[PDB]
Amino acid sequence: VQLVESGGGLVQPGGSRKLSCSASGFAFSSFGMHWVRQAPEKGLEWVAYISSGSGTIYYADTVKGRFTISRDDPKNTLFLQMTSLRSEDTAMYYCVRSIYYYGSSPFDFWGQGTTLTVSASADIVMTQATSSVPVTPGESVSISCRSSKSLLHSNGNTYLYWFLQRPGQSPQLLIYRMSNLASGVPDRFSGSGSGTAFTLTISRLEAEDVGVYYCMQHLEYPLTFGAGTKLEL
Amino acid sequence: SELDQLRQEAEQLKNQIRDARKACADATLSQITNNIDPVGRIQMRTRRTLRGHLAKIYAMHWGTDSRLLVSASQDGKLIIWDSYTTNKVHAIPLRSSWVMTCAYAPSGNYVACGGLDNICSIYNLKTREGNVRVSRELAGHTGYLSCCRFLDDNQIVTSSGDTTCALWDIETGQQTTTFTGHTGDVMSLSLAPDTRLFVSGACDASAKLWDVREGMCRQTFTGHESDINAICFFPNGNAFATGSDDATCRLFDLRADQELMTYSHDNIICGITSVSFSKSGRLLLAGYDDFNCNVWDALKADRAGVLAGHDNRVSCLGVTDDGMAVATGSWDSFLKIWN
Amino acid sequence: SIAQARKLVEQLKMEANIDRIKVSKAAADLMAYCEAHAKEDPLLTPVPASENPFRE
Amino acid sequence: WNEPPVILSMVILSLTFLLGLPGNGLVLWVAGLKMQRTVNTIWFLHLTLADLLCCLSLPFSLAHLALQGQWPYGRFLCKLIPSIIVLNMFASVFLLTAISLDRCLVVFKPIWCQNHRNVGMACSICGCIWVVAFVMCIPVFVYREIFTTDNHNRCGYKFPTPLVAITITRLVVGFLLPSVIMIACYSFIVFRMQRGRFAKSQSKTFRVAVVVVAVFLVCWTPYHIFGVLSLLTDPETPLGKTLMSWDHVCIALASANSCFNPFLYALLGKDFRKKARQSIQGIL
Amino acid sequence: LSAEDKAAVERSKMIDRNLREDGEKAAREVKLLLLGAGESGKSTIVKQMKTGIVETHFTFKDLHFKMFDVGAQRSERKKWIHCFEGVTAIIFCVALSDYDLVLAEDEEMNRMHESMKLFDSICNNKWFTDTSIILFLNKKDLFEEKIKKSPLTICYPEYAGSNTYEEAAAYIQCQFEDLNKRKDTKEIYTHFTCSTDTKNVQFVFDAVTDVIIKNNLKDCGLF
Q: Which domain holds residue C28?
């Protein structure tokens, strides 16, 4: 499982760029693709989404109508055609796969990403209490957040996903729905929630935990990421 | 020495066993359960209607979560259904379209199947690639596979068309223990609640109890007069029912070593295809060859109800682990849920 | 000759040495088990739509 | 009035709403819910729908034929009701013709039907037939106008003349081509089933073919015969009086044809009767 | 009342479409069942047409064929014969030379008698009521050579005729066809297997076409 993104570099205002990503190691047709943007001084941000059948393509308000996403089933390559690129869009883009079914783990694998530098409402609001806290090896820490709307759906499922972005690496899914841990994640991670307030407990902290923890909601298609909590050793 | 003495000793042992079973028969179950109130009429309706398969369904099994259920049909594809939403989770295209048996591991990771092909195909549902692939092909049987059930997360036991049973290890893929007590084609197989014992029925009109660790036959029952089509273990683990073509179900107990009572009716002349017990065991649902499924009281032995939702032979029947609902499959290419 | 003959006699003589429990005790135990879980059988009694997940 | 034409018309009408409505309803419900969606099943569904619509329009059609002198129901209704009637009639005729052509092609190209004949092709053909039927009805809606005498209004074709043109067009495309197509299809089927190295008696095929053809002809001949004679016979000669008095029998028998169709195509199958009886027993 | 289950419903619809497409493609190929006593005959037939269930695919005149051979099963057919209820036709193979040769454990029983009993049991089965049968009489030259010395009355004492090929062939054909009871529903397609190729395949194609025509005509009610 690997995602090699290409098409970055510099670009002048109002230009156009076509980002390409070749999927390998898995069925690209069955998995849906997500574009997560992250600026040099900002957290993650959802860009667009495309389903397996190339249907129900939805875009964010900040890029609503200006960008378009396409995919090639027999070629197994994702394309993102951007037009009239603005200076505010200067940021790095991440490619993420997703498969939706009972017991699935969406946003499990995160690509490498390519840096794209531009030459010179009513959505869910996620707010974190603290942005940076000191941590020491062997101790226990907890990360808390809040949401402007209850994510607990009538079906009992809570659409809350946590991610960890280590320095120099892409984000990784730690816990999805606060009940099931992602594959390969140590069992020392635990999450909880009360419908509106959520918490992420990390027991037996280790040097491998140094990074920025991000939160994401999936109840509504206009995803919104939190401010991000950085743990400094 | 000679076959005459061996046959004489066998006949003497059979006579002794029959005399012991007769002496052990102190009282019956019907006369004692007469003081219990009747369950009355039970009205079950089709809550969900699954119309995915395009061929005759032959087997199904519920998962540990009591929400996912696997189904096998002659079309050569396995479908994982979501009982609450009727959604298709995965579609496993089988290399052999003659599948007639399927199993769902308790952990929800692996699923097995088989049929006319002596090779049992194992499939993993939680692969990192997201596509279901053949985990391991268990070959070595001579006859067709009739029933299979996951003994554990890494061990599986299945019955073949021949008069033998084998226990396979997913790690190595070899027969850890081979049972050779049956004298006819094995058709049914069911595991006990403790996972240490399992019962199996064959066309020799008898049901025998086997031990996993000991690897030997613990008990043998000969209450039926025809072939046994299905078998289910009582929730308490001390009894089990069996379905046969003579249209006369018979309940047996592992401690009494005989048949407790029978379930039959005059108008019921068709054979049984599947049998299952409720969470409490008070209701014994059995699917017949007819287009209807009847419900029997485990203690009173009365027809508490009938299900006329299908229009073809009922092939399989399975009650959820939580007893919240029961699914019934038939050759009509439909799988409905009742409760 | 003795492969399928002596083995059958051995199996039948070793299977008969098992212990036998009274049928009345087994019937009483089965009745007690069925009565204990009478309240935990959604199929035995009518479960309301509030708890039934299949209820529309 | 107690005239023989009126008595026969009322008897034929009562036979339509007594035989067709229950039978057509049952056939539609069965083929729609209690049976799979096979090619023949889709054909039977479309035919039953067309026949039910024709039977439901029969009373309105006869009431319009009777009230051709005043018709105080306005302009759009005189253009709509006959338009819908003719549309349903042409749809039923085209569905019968397509069923005949399919039954013929089954025996004419067996290998082709096993590779390309599916439910999608049948649905596409039915859609094309219903579309062509709509285009065949526009002449009825566009030319149908209203005129008025010195004291009352009258709806008709006051306006070759559109009346004769549309009459000949309907005649041709409703009797000459469908009838000859069905005749050729059944004749070829019988000729190929009676001959060959594996020939057999199969008298049932011949009987079904001849009875269906006879019913269709006896039903659809009088209407067209009175139509062609109406343009050649003036309303002054005594023959014109008989034509005007027996015209309603034409539509009566045309609707009786739609009421009898469910009994000649759907119920003949050995599999449909089983499901029908099962559903009846279930309801009862 | 849906937040994330939209993708689940989309996946379900895609899987349903894929299954429907596979079914339309599956039912597009003809399926046949191969049966008959003796392994040499079935082996020769499979070779001319080109363990458990043995699957074989071969296309002839733009028509697909799925041959099913269950000779390697060797188990009670009463519990799995019903799986072939939806087959188009059953090909029964029997070697004419078996009229004289017998099996190992015969006990005064001719192999031809066992073949006839098997044919009668498979023909009068309740699961093959509407399924046709294609009887192929293998070992034509061998039988023609044996009848020169070994008479046919050895297996059929009631047979009274000349020890020739045409008469004996017609008598065997009649005896094999007399076992059929559903003279109206069944239709036995008999043929003498030839040594040269491109001959049996043509007869199989013709029989399959005739059976398909008859089935489609019966489904509509005209037959």
A: 1-51
Strand order in the sheet with B186-191: B186-191, B197-202, B206-211, B217-221
Domain annotation covers residue C56: no
E213/D110 Cβ within 8 A: yes
Residues 6 or more apart from E37 whose CB is under 8 A from it? E93, E94, E98, E111, E114, E115, E118
Task: Identify residue D22 by its one-letter amino acid code.
Answer: P
What technique was this entry resolved by? cryo-EM
Give the nearest partner residue to B10 out of C8, C24, C47, using CB atoms: C8
D92, two tokens: 């039923």
Counted domains in chain A: 2
Residues A45 and A84 reside in one and the same domain: yes
Total length of chain C: 56
Residue E26 phi, psi (nearest 5): -70, -50
A99 to chain B, any CB pair closer than 8 A? The answer is: yes
With beta carbons less than 8 A apart as the criterion, state whether B74 and B53 touch: no
Distance CA D174, CA D89 (A): 9
CA distances from A4 to A43, A200, D237 (A): 22, 31, 92
Which CATH number is E29-211's, of 3.20.20.70, 3.40.50.300, 3.30.70.20, 3.40.50.720? 3.40.50.300
Is the domain of A73 the same as that of A163?
no
CATH number at residue A163: 2.60.40.10
Q: At what angle do helices D4-33 and D270-283 cross, to 10 degrees?
A: 90
**Phi/psi of residue D239, nearest 5 degrees:** -60, -40
Interchain touch D–E (≥3 Cβ pairs closer than 8 Å): yes
Maximum CA extent, chain C: 67
Domain co-membership, A80 together with A161: no
The verdict on D193 touching E (C-beta cutoff 8 Å) is yes
Query: Looking at the partner chain, which of E1, E3, E11 has a beta carbon nearest the beta carbon of A101?
Result: E11
User: What does the alpha-carbon distance between residue A29 and residue A35 come to, in Å, rounded to a whole number?
Assistant: 16
Pairing mode, if any, of strands B206-211 and B197-202?
antiparallel
Give the nearest chain E residue to B114 (CA atoms): E52
β-bridge pairing A189-193 and A132-134: unpaired
Please tell me whether residues A87 and A141 are part of one structural domain. no
Q: Do B10 and C9 touch (CB under 8 A)?
A: yes
Q: Which residues, 6 or more positions from C29, have their beta carbon under 8 angstroms from its beta carbon?
A: B236, B238
**Closest among B23, B16, B90, B13 to B52, alpha carbons compared:** B90
Q: Which structural domain, as residue segments, surrounds residue A27?
A: 2-118
Where do the structural domains in chain E lie, given as residue ranges? Answer: 29-211
CB neighbours of B42 closer than 8 A, spacing ≥ 6? B283, B295, B304, B305, C43
Look at residues B148, B188, B187 and name the one whose alpha carbon lies nearest to residue B170: B148
Q: 3-class SS at E52?
A: coil
Listed residues A55, A88, A118: the one ending a domain? A118
What whole-number distance in Å separates Cα of residue B112 and Cα of residue E165? 54
Per DSSP, what are the bridge partners of residue B231?
A: B242
Tokens of B224: 């039926």
Chain E residues whose beta carbon lies within 8 Å of the beta carbon of residue D205: 217, 222-223
E10 in contact with A at a CB cutoff of 8 Å? yes
In a shared domain, residues A110 and A22? yes
Which chain E positions have a beta carbon within 8 Å of B162's beta carbon?
A: 75
Backbone phi, psi, residue E55, to 5° = -100, 140
Q: Do B9 and C9 touch (CB under 8 A)?
A: yes
Number of domains in chain C: 1
Q: How far apart are CA D211 and CA D206, in angstroms?
A: 8
Task: Determine the residue of chain E that is closest to D116 in CA distance.
Answer: E28
Helix axes D162-171, D119-143, angle to 10 degrees: 160
In the CATH hierarchy, which fold is given to the domain comprising B3-338?
Methylamine Dehydrogenase; Chain H (2.130.10)
CA distance D116 to B85: 35
